[PDB]
């Protein structure tokens, strides 16, 4: 039981970690940064799709 | 007759290259900011920037 406290609070900060870090105010691990494309290149349709994950 | 004429025709031509010049001049401008559109339309197009950002 006593155990299972550490492990209910510890899941709870891995929760926290994951809808907290975020860049300037866009999140990163909640699951709402999907894909996304960085142009990476001097003309159009040059970028890279980085997907973040929940 | 030809002498006089010839005269007026270099001035007619003078202010035809000077209407060139100050039209050139305006198109100088005009690619300057159409150039900074296409650097900031980049910056737009990068993933990392949010809603607000664009």
């Known amino acids: ?54 | 007759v030809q002498s006089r004429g010839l005269d007026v025709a270099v001035r007619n031509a003078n202010d035809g290259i000077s209407i060139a010049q100050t039209a050139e001049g305006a198109m100088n401008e005009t690619t300057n900011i159409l150039q900074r559109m296409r650097d900031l339309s980049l910056q737009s197009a990068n993933g990392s920037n949010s809603k607000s950002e664009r």
């Open chain 1, 1 to 54: 039981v006593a155990i299972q406290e550490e492990i209910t609070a510890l899941n709870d900060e891995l929760n926290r970690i994951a809808e907290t870090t975020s860049f300037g105010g866009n999140k990163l691990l909640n699951g709402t940064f999907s894909t996304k494309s960085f142009q990476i290149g001097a003309d159009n349709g040059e970028a890279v799709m980085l997907t973040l994950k929940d």
